[model samples]
Every structure is written in C-alpha cells, then in structure tokens.
Target chain A: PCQNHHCKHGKVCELDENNTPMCVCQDPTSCPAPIGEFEKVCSNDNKTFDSSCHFFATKCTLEGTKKGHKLHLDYIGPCKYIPPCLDSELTEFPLRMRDWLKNVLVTLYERDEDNNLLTEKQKLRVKKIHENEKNYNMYIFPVHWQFGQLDQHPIDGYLSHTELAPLRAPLIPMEHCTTRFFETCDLDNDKYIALDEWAGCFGIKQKDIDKDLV
Target chain B: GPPGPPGPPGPSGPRGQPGVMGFPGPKGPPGAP
Candidate 1:
C-alpha cells in the first residue's frame, strides 16, 4: 500500500522502518515522461530536465547538499545561455510593461460590448481613459486599475505581499524588473506599497490622482 | 608598496552580439468579436 501511494512534485512516499508512510526525494526517472517541449525546464545549473517535475524532484534528492540549496528552476524552456541583465535594459523594462498593460486594457474594452468582459465600474473607468486621445495620463490609469484588480479582500490602500502574489509569482522569473519595480514602489521604506506610492513608482502625475477610480 | 606603472592596454576582442530580450508572455485567448 505504501509503495502505491502518490506523492507531490518534489517528493515520493515510502515506508519507513516502522512501516509508516514517509516522504522523500522523488527519483527523477520515476517522473512521468514529458509530453512536449513546453513541459521541459532549465535549472540554474544549466542542465535541462524532462519537466519541472523532474527538475524539482532531482533537486529534492540533493536536499542537504550545497548544490541542492543553490539549485533553482531558471526558466520554462530547455537550458540555454542567458546574458546578465544590463542596467539600461532594467530602466526600460517598466516603461514597456506600463505601455503593454494599457494596450491589454484597451483591447479588452474594445471587445466588451455584449461580452461584459469588465465590470460596470471597470468599464466606466476604462471608457474615460480610452476616450482621452492624447497625453501620458492615460498611460498611468492602467497601473492604478491593475492595483485595484489585484487588491482583493479588505480593499485597503496598501498592497500586502499576498495582494500582489498573483502578478509577482509568474513575472519574477521571467521579467528581471518585476522585483526591482516593486521594491522601488515601496518609496516610504515601509514593507507594503500604498496606492500613492504605487502610482508614484510608475511616474503617475499628482494632479490626476484618483484613489476612488482604483 | 607603491603601485607599478600601468601595463599596456590589450587589443579589444571582437564584440559579441547583444543577448535577445525575454520572450513576451503567450497571447490570451481570442475575445468576443
């Protein structure tokens, strides 16, 4: 029965000396065969794994070893050389991210007619930004709007780590700026970033500040 | 001890091509027409 038990991604179930079920490093070979390229991942060691399941499982085997602690899933694809992030590139990342967010919202608004893609409140706010044909002000609204969307539960002016988790979790590994951008957003040095602080990080204007819209 | 005179500058090596940018996230499913 113990040998038949299922285990999580990084572990395998086994029977101990006492015959009790225990979890241990899952053998990489024991992992399911990868179905496609998308299932593969690159580890920091620059080695490719059949899948994230295999990578993390193999990492589990090295638990107490130095290499194990140092190992991390570097990216989604197979192992390939990646250059160090340059300072110039880091500076431009947020600008492009901000512009992209705006475009995504505009695209959603355009298709919202009968689909009801956005809530009434969101549609109203998005409509205003869409109508404003010119100026950088439109660029800033999307950031604020996203803050509102992510700030689920309590709706406090501050965004706790949990509030931002959904966005940060996926982007951190992909976008180098994800961490730096948020760190700088906490201008007050407090752990959490307030609405004003969040907007300020994106270079939003003080005149156009609209906490209610958020 | 005082530092020695600077060594002669070495010849510049060939510049490597710039690294590619990270790929953008996958496009979302098509929205309503």
Candidate 2:
C-alpha cells in the first residue's frame, strides 16, 4: 500500500518503529536505471554516480562518520575536473551568473512560442529587456525576475532562508562562490535580502529599479 | 673395527632457485583508474 506512493530520488517510504510511514535511503542497487545524462551527478570526491539518487543514497549509508558529514552532491552531471575557485574567480562569478540568467530567460522566451512558459506580464518585461538597445538595461530584467521567482511564502519583498533554499541548496556544494554571494546580498545585517539589495549584489545600477517587475 | 671418526660433515646442498613470479595475476580490477 505505502509502497505504491512515490518518494523523491534517493529515498524510499517504509514503516518506522511505530508503523508510521517514513522516508529513508533505498539500497543503491534498487534505484531505477538512469534514463538520460541529466539524471547523473558527480560527487566532490570525483566519482560519477548513475544519478542523484545513487549519489545521495550512497551518501546516506555513510551517515554518522566524518566523511558522511563532509560529503555533498557536487553538481548535476558526471564527474569532471574543476579547477579550484580562486579569489579572482569568485569576484567574477556574479558577473558571469548575471549574464547566464539573462541568456537563460532569452532562450526560454525564444522557445515560448506557445506563451505557456512565462506569464504575459513577465513576457512584457522580458520583451523590454530583450529589445533594449542599451546593454545596461539588459542586466536588470533577470535580477528582478530572479528575485520575484525566489521570494515566496508571503511575498513580502524579501528572501527568507526557506525561500532561498531551492537556489542555495544545490549550488552551495558545487559553486564555491554561492555562499559568499548570498551573504553579501544581505547587506543591511537584517538577515533577509531585499530586492534592491539582491540587485546590488549582482552589480545592477540604481536607476534601473523597476519595482513593478518584482 | 670401531666406526671411523664421523666422516667430515657433508657439504651443504645447493640453494633452490626462486620460482618464476606468477604471471602478474590477471591485470587487476583497475582500481582508481
């Protein structure tokens, strides 16, 4: 009965000591075969796992040891050599990431012929950025859009820890720049990052704030 | 007659040659490759 219910990758639902259903790591062998390259992930130790499921289940089995505590999912694909992140490289991350976010949105817009991917309001804002002649405004849309995307729950114009989890959790392990980036984003020492602060962290200009976009 | 004085201690036998190293056993599991 409970077995029919689906669990997230790397976990299985089973009865606990009290007979209530609980999620725990399945045997690595029991994980379904990976169907595509997207399913695979690499560990920090430079091993290629069949999938995130495989990597996490293997990690779970090591629980309670120093290695287990230290181990993390390195990235979304098979193991590859990544040079150490230097201080200079860390400084450049936001610049590259800002462009990356913009390009991703542009790509989505180009493919969103059916208009299903982005809401009409989102499309209007993105269209302005897309067609803008100035390079400066090009960077604004994505930063504002990303803040809007991540700020959830009450939508109170700030990113709480829970709200930031989806972006933070996976990147922290692989991208050395991630933690420092967000830490600097919370400029006011209030522990939450406001929209202006988030944009500032990515090097966006002051006059570009379109409060409506967020 | 009483046995002659014990014959001079027999010369020590030649040392046996070492066996050929077993053909480096089937190239191993490629650990860490």
Candidate 3:
C-alpha cells in the first residue's frame, strides 16, 4: 500500500522492507524500451568460400617441402616450355617461366584456405613448417638424383671469399620453386598439396634456391 | 401601361349545309362471251 496519495506520474509507489512506501523511478535503463516491429530474413542457411581446396593444397605443399620430397606432377603449370611438357622448340625458357609463375601465383595465393586464415599463432606455425620444408627439399635432398634433374650443384671455391653467387642466385630462384612445389602437391583438388609441383612449374632443380625468383 | 386585364372568350360559328348524293344509273351490255 502506498502512503502518499496521488504519486507523481512515471513514478510508482511500492512497499519497502519495513512496510514503508518507497518511490521508484521508471527509468529507461532499469526498464528498457520494447523491441521494434522490423525483422531480418536471410536467403541461405550456409555460405561456402570459393577457394575451399586451397588450404589442402597449401598443406601438402608445406609438408612436401619439409619432408625433402619432390612436389607432385599434377599441380604443375601446363606451360608451353620446360621438359615434362615443353614448347618443343625450347627457345623461350623466359616466356614459359613467366607464364608458369603467373599461374603459380593464381594457384598458390589466389584462393585462401579457411585453415590458412586462422589466428597468427596457427599461421606462424604453418609458415615455420613451410620454411623448414623449403630448406629440407632444396638443401637436404639436392643431389639424391632420384628425380634426375634435382642433382646438387658444385660448391664454388670463391663462395668462401667472393659475393657467394653460387649460394645467392640459385637460392633466390629456388624459393619460387616452392610456389611451384605447392601447386604440384595440390593433387585431388582437396587443397592438400605437395612440392613436386616446384620442379614441374619451373622445370628447374629445387636444390639451388639461388636460381629462381618467386 | 400597368398590368393588362384577362382576355374574353370568342363567339361560336354557324353550322354549314350538307352536300347532295348522285342518282343510280341503269344496267346494260352483257352479250360478250
């Protein structure tokens, strides 16, 4: 029961603990406004990325590089130059390499895997694994001679004193080889990939990272 | 002139005489076969 008669508008009277009347303000914060009448409708229940297989291919690429294995043959660019599938004349390695690299970029970074977009911690680990894979594939198995073309080059005596061209030239181009490797490894289109695409894309050895440019 | 008065009714005309009727002629000429 309220003690005061005709309490002010927008204020209600209520019985407090000791049977005493208390005035409580009808503030918007305490009592929120009602919801609006408008509603939202979505067209579809699920949405999928265009490049779903990219993650799997990239994973295979990274794993192949780490394991020092040659990238698979399928993911390689169907270029008009190079041995496995060349332009027959063999006049323009430059044109073939350029076109191949363009395709490599399309195949590599064009589609981001959902897994690749995870937190930096996860991606950083993947990046580290990719780096380790590159070292293993380019350095460890440089001269295993299994792929015929992957034989390691001789170490230049001037590398100890001079500009280390042997280490620099071959290594630079070799990094791009990994891009091809990534493409070659993308077998089954599941986004899981291998590094053999490296050789297929560049038609060059993975050993000398100094030769290719990504 | 102010307002005119109402007009009076006209007188009835006299009846005319009736015309005479024609006389009945004789019957003849019946021999054409």
Candidate 4:
C-alpha cells in the first residue's frame, strides 16, 4: 500500500505500469482544505499557499526550474508585508535564535521526567548547560549543541531546510526576524546549513566550527 | 507511547569560542525605468 511506500514531500506514492511503487507530484487540489488563515503558508516568493501541502505540490510541478529550486517555505503564516531587516536588526536576529535554542534545553531540564524524551547523555549535557547558564556563558558550545539537535534527521552535520524546520516553523510566528535570519543563514544559497555556515551566520567564532562536535 | 530502545548513541568530545559580525553584500543590476 502507499503507507509502506516512501515519497518525499510534495510527492505521493502510486503504483505504476508494472504495479511498482512510484512517486509522483501530488495534485494541489487533492490537498486537504485549510482550516483557517492559520493554515496559510508564506512562500519565499511572498505569496501564500492555502497550506504547506499546497505549497509543496505546486513546487513539485516546477521541479526543474530556477524559481522552484529557489522557492521555499519562508514562514508559517499568510503572506504579509515585512520591512527589510536593518543592519542593527539583522545582528540581533541571530543572537535571539541562539538564545532561544539554549532556553529550550533549559526548559527540558527543569521538567525532569519530561526530559525523558531525550537521551540520558543528552539529559546530562543539558544539565550542565542549565547549571552554569547564568553564572558565565559558553556561546560557542551551545551553538554547536543546537546544531546537533536540529541535525537529527540525517545527522550528517548539515541542516537541510526540513531538518531546520522544527525550529524555523515555531520561531517564524513568534519572531519577525526569524524568516530573514534563516534565509540569510545559508550563505551559499544551496538550501542547507553546514556547521560552518550556522556558526558563522550567527556571528559565532568561525575558527571554532567543527565536524567532530556535530 | 512507550519509549523506543536506545540505539548506539554514545560518544564524547571537547569543543570551544564566540564570533564577530561581518559585512553584507550591497547591490548589482536591474532594469530601472
């Protein structure tokens, strides 16, 4: 069945001429109707799709083109006018993301059993991060830690757009700078965030970025 | 749901530093009319 077959986002599995599982671009019409304005997604093109499903299906249809290759899920809300990021503002954006990542672990640690969701080694690591959090700070370490956390999907030490989604999706609505911050984060525009790229974009010590930690 | 069994996630390492901001690109061309 289609459940056993695998397909990337924007594509659905279908049996082919030989009855073998194959993936094809999903019909935008087949996507579930949006619940409300909240389900609307803003694309990098500054237009909103009814939902993530609609956006992906449309992108699938444009698979080989520059616009499609460049298109991305920019934020989690309907398209709206957002002012350009000021130089001063851009500097602050990355800092907030780093700060947010650090706090997420702190929240997990304070909750104890809820921390059970994470590995023991990760739990211990978070414990150390929580204890010395305010006494003094270790900015680079936490940045590295956050990258490892987000890179869990393939854990290849690079952050694909999807790998970074859990953080990006939530932050977009809460932080105006969120979308701009990440869009610029991938310096090469290759659609992934390498360890060096993440650290550098956030203004972390460039020399410190390493593959061994991630 | 029950927690899944932990699969080989053991390793340890040392790491280090903070960083500075850099200049952003300015501009190129367009059809201005």
All models: lDDT? 0.71, 0.72, 0.32, 0.71
Q: Write the per-residue lDDT of candidate 3 for residues B1-33, one digit (tens) a residue.
A: 877855554677776433212111222456999
Quality of candidate 2's docking, in CAPRI categories? Answer: incorrect
Interface C-alpha root-mean-square deviation, candidates in order: 9.9, 25.6, 67.5, 9.6
Off by over 4 Å in 3: A1-88, A115-214, B1-33
Off by over 4 Å in 1: A1-86, A111-116, A131-134, B1-33
Angstrom error at residue A189, model 2: 6.3
Question: Which candidate model has the greater lDDT, 1 or 3?
Answer: 1
Query: Which residue ranges in model 2 land beyond 4 Å of their true spot?
Result: A1-4, A8-25, A32-38, A43-48, A56-74, A79-81, A132-134, A153-180, A188-192, B1-33
Candidate 4 Cα errors over 4 Å, as ranges: A1-8, A11-25, A110-117, A132-138, A150-170, A179-197, A200-212, B1-33
lDDT of 2 by residue, A1-214 (tens): 3745677766789888988777877899988678886567766577788986787677765667786566666566566655556667666777877776787677777666667767777787788878765445677888888888888886999888668766764555556567677877888967999988888888887777778877
Candidate 3: C-alpha RMSD to true structure equals 46.6
Task: Report the TM-score of the second chain of model 1 against its true counterpart.
Answer: 0.28
The number of the candidate with the highest TM-score is 4
Q: Per-residue alpha-carbon lDDT of model 4 for A41-141, expressed as tens digits?
A: 88778888999899888877775777567867877778887766677777756666566556655555555575454567667777666666241154555
Every model's DockQ, to 2 decimals? 0.02, 0.01, 0.00, 0.03
Best-to-worst order by DockQ is 4, 1, 2, 3
Question: Docking quality tier of candidate 1?
Answer: incorrect
Model 1, span A95-131: residue lDDT tens: 6777767776777776677646677777776788777
Candidate 4 matches the true fold with a TM-score of 0.61
